[PDB]
Structures are given as structure tokens and as C-alpha cells.
Structure 1
Amino acid sequence: AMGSESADLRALAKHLYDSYIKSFPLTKAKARAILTGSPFVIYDMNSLMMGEDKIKFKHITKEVAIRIFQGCQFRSVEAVQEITEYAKSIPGFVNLDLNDQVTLLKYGVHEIIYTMLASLMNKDGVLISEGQGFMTREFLKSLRKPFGDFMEPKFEFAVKFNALELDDSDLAIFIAVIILSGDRPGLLNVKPIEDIQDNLLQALELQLKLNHPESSQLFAKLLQKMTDLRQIVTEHVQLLQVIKKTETHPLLQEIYK
């Protein structure tokens, strides 16, 4: 029995890494290799126009700021399905009450999207179209109000988050901790979700201790980032309030809400 707890936690961590690799083809490791230095760079309106020829976008059915926002929504819809697939491989998740599964995902996917978005970001821009393109932070910032300000807070979060230097094996456990959050509103069976999250937290803590021995209290630091993810999501939900009440297919509208 000596060492068996450790071994079980490392086995869970490896299981989550392996499934994360299957659910998310464009890993942080691959993204960082692209970002450090080939993708087509969109750095202004003109290069965005030629970018449309070099890259086949799937969301084009208008004004440039609106098309970019719709492109981001298309990608987020794809990410919801990748995250839902990944969640099925979190031990315990599929055996939960079906309604609680839906609830956990409804509230979890946005926090996860912005966590994983940081893997594709550096301080100067973001990979798009599976690494085929790179859009500068400055170009996004330049878009007309209120679209100039919709990606900037995500960049702010990502620069700080990426300074933790987490890798894919760390993130796989962290995103599972996020999904198994017992405090989402409307959950029927809270105790089993907390039990699963307890074991995931143990696994995350041991993973960070072994992978980042030089990083004092990285576990605590990473848990604290949950306050900023929740801030980012809340703030982002408010901005989606504006866009639907100041800006402007019926099936298309259905696909997304």
C-alpha cells in the first residue's frame, strides 16, 4: 500500500492527458512551437481581406468587425463539442445524473474556453484556424466599439495565466477540476460531484508538485486563477448583452444561443 495513493493519482493524471490529446488536436505544446517561430498573419483590415483567400473559413454566409465576432462564435461552438467529448473521459462524469452533466457543461465550457484560448495566445496575438493563421492583438484592439474591447480582456488574462508556464499534462487535470464544480446553480446531486472533484484536486496538486517543483505554491496560484476566469466570463456575458441589444439564419440563430 505504500506509494499506492501516489500511483493512483499519477494514473489518473496520465489518463486525463491521453484523453485531452484525443479531444484537443491543437495542443499547447504544438501552439507554442508555432507562436515562437508558417501561419498567415492578419495584422490589419487589408491583410484580413487577403487572409480570406489563403485560409478557408467556415463561418462566412458583412462588416468586418461583425464577421470576426461571428468567426469567434463559430470556433466557440466547435470548442463546446470538444470539451463535452473530453468531459466523458473524466472518471465519474458520465455516471452522474444526465441533467447534472448538462448543467456542469452549460456553466463550465466558457471558463474552459478562455483557459484553452490562452494556450493559443502570446502577448501580441492569437492563433486561429488550427494554427493556419495568426491575428494580432493590436488589430483586434483597433476594431470599432464595442468590438475593439471584446478580445483584449482575454489577452490580459492569458498573459498572466501563461506566466504560470503550465503544460498540457497540467491543463488536462485543471480543466477537469473546472468541469466538476459542485457550485453550479441547479445541480441536483452535489455530493458525488464534490467527491470526484476532491480526487481531481489531489491529482492536480501532485502533478504540479512533481512537474513544477521550483514553483512555490503553484497549486494555490492556479486555483486563484478561477476568480479571474469567472470575472472574464461574467464580463464577457455582459458584453454579449450589449451586442444583442445594440447590433443586429433563424436556424442559424438557433444553432448558437
Structure 2
Amino acid sequence: KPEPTDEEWELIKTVTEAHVATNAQGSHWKQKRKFLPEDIGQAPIVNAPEGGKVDLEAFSHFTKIITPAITRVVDFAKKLPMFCELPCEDQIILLKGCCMEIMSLRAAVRYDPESETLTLNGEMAVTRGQLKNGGLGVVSDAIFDLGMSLSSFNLDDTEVALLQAVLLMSSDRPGLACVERIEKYQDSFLLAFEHYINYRKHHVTHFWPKLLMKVTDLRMIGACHASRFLHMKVECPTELFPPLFLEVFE
């Protein structure tokens, strides 16, 4: 099992630092996180159909921190030379495509089995029901389920950073111009990722193949979020949507 080459180690240092610099982790999250009051997201009438409705109050707090979350995803990408040398038209398509896949991953790795909450933007700990009622619906469940199964993977800033790069460099997005050049960058990351996996020597058989399944989960989530955004537009007032939010998922 080949370990990373010299060139791969340099790339690895590039993504890892890119991720860390944009992951709102100056201080460990488990300490800076404030819990969103239990009241928020709580349904007063228990027997009233939930359907696909949205808690406006909860939705309100979420949109207030979604913009800085979206920006860090942009800043992360803009720290990778491979990405910056892609046409601006491709940079847009790629960002609108992986934004939620990377954000969901970033939330999932910050899952706390104790309180059973996800820490968003590195400071807001929410429960499954809060994020579910607040707008995401089933997508909330998808992310929590992912966070539950990621705990044993013990992913470091590098493994998480490489996962983001793989998600970012997806050439299957519609309208992309440099499909080949993007697919190549993705191969370069996948390769460095696997080699780094051999270097880490995790005590779990078929760790790489199990990791790739998680990558498929995030792509399913990001796509499900797309259809979910449309619904939010119907259930929630247009004034509550930040211009950055609209731009990335419109």
C-alpha cells in the first residue's frame, strides 16, 4: 500500500491548511458552542400535522449564520491553486454544486453523541428536530445519521479536507466547460487521499471503500437540499433569505 509521494504531501499540506483556515476552529468547537434554546423549534400543538412546514423562528436563526458558512466554503476553494485557475463560469457551477455537501460534512464531523446536537458555523448547537423543523426536513436526519456513523472513522483535518476537495472537483456538474481538467484534479486528490489513508493505517478493513460510501452520502444530501430549498421559498417569506443564500442555491 503506497504512501503519499513528495508532490502529494505538498498538495496535502495545501488542502489541509486551506480547510483549517476556513473551518472556524480557532478554538475547539465543543467549548465555544452555545446551545440553541430548546424552546426554538418546539411545536406548541403536538397533534397538528407537520407535513413539510417550516418553523419561521428557527429558520430565522439558521439564515443568520448560513451566510458566513457559505463564505468559508468559497474561501476554502479560493485557497486551492487548482481551483483558482478554472474559468469563473466553472468556479460558479462547482461552488453551487458542492456548497451544501461540504457544509453538511463540516456539520457531521462536529456531531456530539452526548447532547446529540450538531454544531453549526462552529458555534450553534442544534438538535435533529430543530434543524429538521427549521427548514431542512429529512435532510436534517440525513446529516445527523452521517454524523453518527462518522464518529468511528476518526477523520483528521486532512481526511476531512481531502473529502471536501473530492466533492468540489466533481466534473459531473451540468454546464461545466473544463470537465477533463476538473476530473484530473479530482484524481490527483483521490490518489493523495488513498495514499494518506495507507500512511494513517486505520484499524478497520476496507476503510477507503467505506469512506467513499460517505462521499456518495453527501452527494445525495446536497441534491436533496436543492429540492428542499425550493420548498423553503414557498413556506418562508422572501425577506428572510440572505442574498448570498439565494445566489448559491438559486
TM range (shorter): 0.7 to 0.9
Gaps of 5+ in 2: 43-53
Alignment correspondent of 2:10: 11
Measure the CA separation in 1 of the matches of 2:157 and 2:231: 35
Q: 1:235 to 1:171 in 2, by over 3 A?
A: same
Deviation at 1:125, TM superposition (A): 0.8
Q: Does 1:196 align with 2:191?
A: no
Q: 1:67 to 1:173 in 2, by over 3 A?
A: same
Gaps of 5+ in 1: 49-63
Alignment correspondent of 1:137: 128
Measure the CA separation in 2 of the matches of 1:5 and 1:164: 20
Pick aligned residue for 1:183 from 172, 176, 199: 172
Alignment correspondent of 2:35: 41
Alignment correspondent of 2:218: 229
Higher Rg of the two aligned structures: 1
SS of the equivalent of 2:118 reads strand
**Equivalence map 1:117-196=2 (5 Å):** 117-123=107-113, 124-128=116-120, 130-131=122-123, 133-137=124-128, 143=133, 149=138, 151-196=140-185
Alignment correspondent of 1:98: 88
Measure the CA separation in 2 of the matches of 1:136 and 1:73: 16
Measure the CA separation in 2 of the matches of 1:150 and 1:40: 22
Bigger drift between 15-24 and 64-73 goes to: 64-73
Q: 1:229 to 1:96 in 2, by over 3 A?
A: same
Identity %: 24
Opposite residue 212 of structure 1, the aligned amino acid is: K
Q: 1:220 to 1:147 in 2, by over 3 A?
A: closer
Alignment correspondent of 2:77: 87
Normalised to the residue count of structure 2, the TM-score between the two structures is 0.79
Opposite residue 111 of structure 1, the aligned amino acid is: E
Q: Does 1:241 align with 2:233?
A: no
Measure the CA separation in 2 of the matches of 1:250 and 1:46: 20
Opposite residue 126 of structure 1, the aligned amino acid is: L
Q: Deviations over 1:153-172 (max 9, x none)?
A: 32112212333221112111
Deviation at 1:118, TM superposition (A): 0.9
Alignment correspondent of 1:30: 28
Deviation at 1:180, TM superposition (A): 0.8
Residues 41 and 136 in structure 1, CA contact (< 8 A), matched pair in contact too: no
Opposite residue 18 of structure 2, the aligned amino acid is: S
Opposite residue 225 of structure 1, the aligned amino acid is: K
Measure the CA separation in 1 of the matches of 2:219 and 2:185: 21
Measure the CA separation in 1 of the matches of 2:228 and 2:240: 23
Q: Does 1:215 align with 2:207?
A: no
Measure the CA separation in 2 of the matches of 1:167 and 1:193: 25
Measure the CA separation in 1 of the matches of 2:198 and 2:208: 8
The Cα RMSD (Å) is 3.1
Alignment correspondent of 1:65: 55
Deviation at 1:186, TM superposition (A): 0.5
Measure the CA separation in 2 of the matches of 1:114 and 1:46: 21
Measure the CA separation in 2 of the matches of 1:155 and 1:250: 28
The higher-RCO structure (CA 8 Å, 6+ apart) is 2
Q: Deviations over 1:193-249 (max 9, x none)?
A: 111111111111111111233232222211221221122223333333333234447
Measure the CA separation in 2 of the matches of 1:129 and 1:200: 25
